Design a protein around this ligand. Structure first.
Ligand SMILES: [Zn+2]
Length: 37
């Protein structure tokens, strides 16, 4: 099943969104904010 509590919580530091995986957060950061520039 696609639903459940068995996962992590991570957050954005530039638009304050929330994500269920750190790799999905990093994919959001490198697309929307890219702080390495
Ligand atoms: Zn963001």
């Amino acid at each position: 099943g696609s639903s459940g509590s068995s996962g992590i919580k991570q957050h954005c530091r530039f638009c304050k969104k929330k994500y269920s995986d750190v790799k999905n957060l990093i994919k959001h950061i490198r697309d929307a904010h890219d702080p390495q520039d």
